[PDB]
Design a binder for this molecule. Sequence first.
Ligand SMILES: Cc1cn(C[C@H](N)C(=O)O)c(=O)n(Cc2cc(-c3ccccc3)sc2C(=O)O)c1=O
Ligand SMILES: Cc1cn(C[C@H](N)C(=O)O)c(=O)n(Cc2cc(-c3ccccc3)sc2C(=O)O)c1=O
Ligand SMILES: [Cl-]
Lengths: 251, 251
Amino acid sequence: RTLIVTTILEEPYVMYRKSDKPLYGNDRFEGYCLDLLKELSNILGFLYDVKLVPDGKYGAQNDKGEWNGMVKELIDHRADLAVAPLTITYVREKVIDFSKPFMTLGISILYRKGTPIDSADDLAKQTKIEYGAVRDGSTMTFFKKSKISTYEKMWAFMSSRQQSALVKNSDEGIQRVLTTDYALLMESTSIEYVTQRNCNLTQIGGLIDSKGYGVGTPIGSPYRDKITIAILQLQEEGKLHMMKEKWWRGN
Amino acid sequence: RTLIVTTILEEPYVMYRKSDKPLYGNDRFEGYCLDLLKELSNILGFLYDVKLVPDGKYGAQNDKGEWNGMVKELIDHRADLAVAPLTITYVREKVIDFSKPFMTLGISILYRKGTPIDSADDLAKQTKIEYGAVRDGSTMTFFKKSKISTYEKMWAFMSSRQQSALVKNSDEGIQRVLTTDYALLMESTSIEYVTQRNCNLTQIGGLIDSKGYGVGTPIGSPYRDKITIAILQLQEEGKLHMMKEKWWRGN
Ligand SMILES: Cc1cn(C[C@H](N)C(=O)O)c(=O)n(Cc2cc(-c3ccccc3)sc2C(=O)O)c1=O
Ligand SMILES: Cc1cn(C[C@H](N)C(=O)O)c(=O)n(Cc2cc(-c3ccccc3)sc2C(=O)O)c1=O
Ligand SMILES: [Cl-]
């Protein structure tokens, strides 16, 4: 059995190689997730075929209970694995299985260096420095759903200043950080990636929530626990560290 | 079926209540893990009976492949669950199953406030400020097994200065931090706990490795995936955050 692996274009996890060389199949791609998949394939001993998810979506449900994205590919048995920056969530665990996480992350703060600002609590109580999130993203939703008073206050500030505080996408948010007196609430993984590449930018404080990226499988897949095992071995032997360092490290 | 839950005395996860009131069974105990277990019991709908692991050990193997501690309790079917600060590891996954993690942690640095020291790389290249770990602990072992050059250098410094750099236990390490020009490499969870209680102390840098605490079950237990589900719901509804804040927050 050659395993079909669903994934999604997303820097630095999955990219097309910058090459016009004759590269076919899996060799057309590079990135953290491709390196992970190679290691998994060598530990478990499987052949695989990487296929980009046709609709370019991660996976969400409609009101009929119909799914899209990589999740739908797994549900339909059109992929054996999803290897992507795919969050392990309660709702998704109802319909697919996941390995234990190969990467753990949390919402954090992207801001300029050399400022007394040190936490989310430092931002919440003031109005001089604007702060927000990508409109309708996971980070915005966290703040909308939060019953923690200090994040309830932050959401109230974001929701009332909806037009300016909430941005269209990650790229626009980073641009707003570099140009105005603004802080972007975003995932720690993305902050690490940006701060490595922009020396004027830094992470502020720690993690505001916690979640993991895991390898998705159909419910009952005999590969799920094997992949957990492989992930733990890669973690303990320092290989996850070196794969992260390969793709995240800047100049 | 009343589930037998193996656990271990460990502040703030599992403690005896400071009370001479007539408290029996589960009511004799308090702590993060007791709160977690209560929530798990209410989501899944199980009765349970907390039993402290007789040998007071987490779980390790000898050369005959014989296990001890909470791991051995699970292997022997003398406990249905282990709910404790029990690390999900490759070797343990060979003999027991684990839920996905309810807490994620990594080695970090405990040091004084107001110093230019900001990372492990800042410590490694100098000798004026001594640094180390608890002798024969998980943190020391990480440095001993590491093939990362900057941690190889740190281990070389710890191993050559073996008598003074390596301490007997966590309590001795913290005391060495507060009295001498010294930094203790320790788990982020414990650093958070200490820094909340000592205002002269701070965490330095980020996480040096990554691991999770999970609920242990015997291999094949039908509770493992259910507990993962419950953990994700507690995470997403902010309950893991508030349980952490209950036990970790200082004065
Ligand atoms: C790599 C990555 C993936 N995902 C998808 C998510 N992990 C999932 O599993 O659905 C994800 O939500 N984020 C965070 C994120 C992305 C966002 C985005 C939305 C539209 C256009 C461009 C970016 S917003 C956002 C966030 O943190 O809120 C990521 O950084
Ligand atoms: C709460 C906790 C548990 N464990 C056990 C470990 N999680 C396991 O699953 O075996 C664990 O290793 N650590 C870290 C740790 C404890 C240590 C200790 C050893 C002897 C006497 C007193 C303390 S040393 C240490 C470390 O980080 O190296 C913990 O902080
Ligand atoms: Cl699992």
